[PDB]
Amino acid sequence: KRPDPMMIRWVNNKMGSVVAVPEELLGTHAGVVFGAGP
Amino acid sequence: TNIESAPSLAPMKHYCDVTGLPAPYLDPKTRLRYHNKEIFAMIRNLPQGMGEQFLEARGAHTV
Amino acid sequence: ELSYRQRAMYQSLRNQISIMDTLMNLVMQFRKVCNHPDLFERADTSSPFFCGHFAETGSFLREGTNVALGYSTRSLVEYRLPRLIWCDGGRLDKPGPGNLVAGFRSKYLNHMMNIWTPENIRSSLEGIENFTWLRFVDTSLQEAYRASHTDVFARAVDLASKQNRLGHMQIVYDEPEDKKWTPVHALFQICERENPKAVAEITTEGVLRDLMNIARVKYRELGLCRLEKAARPRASAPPIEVVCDSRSAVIERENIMFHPAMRKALFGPTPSEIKEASFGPRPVTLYPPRALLPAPDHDKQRFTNITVPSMARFVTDSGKLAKLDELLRELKEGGHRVLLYFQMTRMIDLMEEYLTYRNYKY
Amino acid sequence: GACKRVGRSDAYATEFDLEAEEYVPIPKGEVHKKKEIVQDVTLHDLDVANARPQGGQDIISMMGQL
């Protein structure tokens, strides 16, 4: 299985919250906020 | 070099195979271009091989 | 007792008796409607009468598996104009040979002798001259010139690309030392810089927020977004068209009646644009930032007058079935799930649909 | 800055045997023409033109009502 190239995932539970970013989006403008721009 | 011309890219005017007048129509059956219902009637009543004889003047005969 | 639907059918059958005072077939179809009106003429997805031309399919067998659905819908009211009027300068605004006025008048009245062009505004921008206020209304000479020339739809799309920043300043520039700071180039934008709405969005208990939402909350609480439509238009039509035997007329029909930029605004970005906007190295703006078509007020009817039959009607449309449903919902305590007998075979099939709606086992 | 499509030139009329197209003869005159036109407007035409977007600028006007 592989995640959708265009969708960023937020998930929250008892341990708190994480965001996970497709490696297809790192190196785009969308990666910059995660510290992984062009 | 005796190699010295090429086909046109302009689209081609349509003329009546019988009478050379402008032809709106192309007969599906005999592949002749014809001016009007009078010449379509005549074209469909040609003797054997005369349809090819009209295509030969256009250089379009079946061979 | 018969349902109102059964009653209407049964009445139309006894209208046939006016000829006859086929009776065997009549009494057999009286028996059908008394079983269920769907045995007589089954209820189906329905719509208003359509008062328009369309191209209908002539053969189902020759259509094949792959087919192109063109948009054939056309008005039967069919207004025929000569191209002299509709195309060749009988329209005053459209320039061409034989309309020498229109091209001149377009340039001079919209650009040269037009007070809103930036070269004209800039001469009046000062003192007590007529554009003196422009310095403080938060708009450029370019934007003033745009708003004077684009129509209210085009301006409304441009207004989608804007931010309520003067409302955010109300959140931020708040202390007495902020002196209600406002950009001097936005000085006259008074009511935007101060109104209760922006603050009410931000408070932790939304008292003033709720008070401003009452009307739409009440509307949805009443379920009027979900209640079945009690009426619809009985006939529906497409717009009237000009019929003019010119290619330009056909082009113009597409430009106006199926206007691309309006449609693109309503329905928003295409899938390729969303990809290009998302994978690029830098952000990029989209012609509309979003689909600007409103949400429909009715959650199920949306933007169409098509109606779909329902199992609720199905039960109640037969008086027997309605009565049977009431007693089955207590005989379930006894069982007897298939202790039912029918004089008609198709009635058994309808009962399978009812039972599966009830999820009752056979 | 006005321009108009008059048609397709009928030298192309036999590109196909049917196309939904308006074939017109090539212009027989000079390709460029210079004409003196005396144009009249009124101050009211200027008012109207400055008060509201006019003609093909105001397409949404087709809805009528407001």
Number of H helices, E strands in chain B: 2, 2
The H or E element spanning position D8 is: strand D8-9
Asked whether C and D share 3 or more beta-carbon pairs under 8 angstroms, the answer is: yes
The residues that bridge with C74 in the sheet, in sequence order, are C53
Q: Which two tokens stand for residue B26?
A: 């192309």
**What CA–CA distance (Å, rounded) separates B40 from B45?**
9
Asked if A32 is an interface residue toward chain C (Cβ–Cβ < 8 A), one would say: no
Query: Which residues of chain A neighbour C273 with C-beta distances below 8 Å?
Result: none
Q: Is C96 left (phi over 0), alpha (psi -120 to 50) or beta?
A: left
List the Cα angle C100/C102/C106 in 5-degree steps. 135
Nearest Cβ partner for C100 among D20, D37, D61? D37
List the Cα angle B4/B8/B14 in 5-degree steps. 135
Asked if A33 is an interface residue toward chain C (Cβ–Cβ < 8 A), one would say: no
Chain C: list its partners (3+ Cβ pairs within 8 Å).
A, D
Query: Which residues of chain D neighbour B11 with C-beta distances below 8 Å?
Result: 11-15
Q: Is C246 left (phi over 0), alpha (psi -120 to 50) or beta?
A: beta
CA atoms within 13 A on the CB side of C89: 11
**What CA–CA distance (Å, rounded) separates C97 from C102?**
10
Nearest Cβ partner for C278 among A27, A28, A37? A28
The answer to whether C165 touches C193, Cβ cutoff 8 Å, is no
Nearest Cβ partner for D11 among B10, B14, B26? B10
Nearest Cβ partner for C106 among D2, D22, D53? D2
**What CA–CA distance (Å, rounded) separates C28 from C39?**
11
C180: Cβ contacts below 8 Å, ≥ 6 apart: C173, C193, C194
In total, the C-beta contacts within 8 angstroms joining chain B to chain D are: 10
Q: Which two tokens stand for residue D15?
A: 């590109």
**What CA–CA distance (Å, rounded) separates C305 from C302?**
8
Asked whether C and B share 3 or more beta-carbon pairs under 8 angstroms, the answer is: no
Q: Does B13 contact D14 at a Cβ distance shorter than 8 Å?
A: yes
**What CA–CA distance (Å, rounded) separates B42 from B32?**
11
Other beta carbons within 10 angstroms of residue D33's beta carbon come to: 8
Residue D66's alpha-carbon distances to C4, C288, D14, D63, in angstroms, are 43, 24, 48, 8
Closest residue in A to C271 (Cα) is A6
Query: Which residues of chain A neighbour C283 with C-beta distances below 8 Å?
Result: 29
Residue C302's alpha-carbon distances to C227, C238, C265, C266, C305, in angstroms, are 12, 18, 19, 15, 8
**What CA–CA distance (Å, rounded) separates A13 from C14?**
68
**What CA–CA distance (Å, rounded) separates C70 from C168?**
49
Closest residue in D to B15 (Cα) is D14
**What CA–CA distance (Å, rounded) separates C121 from C111?**
12
Query: Which residues of chain B neighbour D15 with C-beta distances below 8 Å?
Result: 11
The residues that bridge with C75 in the sheet, in sequence order, are C52
Residue carrying structure tokens 């309605």 = C322
What's the sign of the alpha-carbon dihedral C79, C83, C86, C90?
negative
What one-character-per-residue DSSP string does C187-213 give?
TT-HHHHS-HHHHHTTSSS-HHHHHTT
Nearest Cβ partner for C107 among D1, D21, D59? D1
Residue C55's alpha-carbon distances to C51, C62, C73, C338, D19, in angstroms, are 13, 16, 8, 48, 20
Resolution to 1 decimal place, in Å: 2.9
D45: Cβ contacts below 8 Å, ≥ 6 apart: C105, C109
Asked if D24 is an interface residue toward chain C (Cβ–Cβ < 8 A), one would say: no
At residue C112, the 3 state secondary structure works out as helix
At residue A30, the 3 state secondary structure works out as helix
The H or E element spanning position C53 is: strand C52-53
Q: What is the DSSP letter of C75?
A: E
Residue C278's alpha-carbon distances to A3, A8, C50, C269, D43, in angstroms, are 16, 11, 43, 12, 52
Q: Does D20 contact C95 at a Cβ distance shorter than 8 Å?
A: no
Strands C74-75 and C52-53: antiparallel
Query: Which residues of chain B neighbour D11 with C-beta distances below 8 Å?
Result: 10-11
Q: Does B11 contact D17 at a Cβ distance shorter than 8 Å?
A: no
- CB within 8 Å of chain D, chain C residues 254-293: 256, 259, 262
Q: Is C12 exposed, middle or buried (0-12, 13-18, 19+ CB in 10 A)?
A: exposed
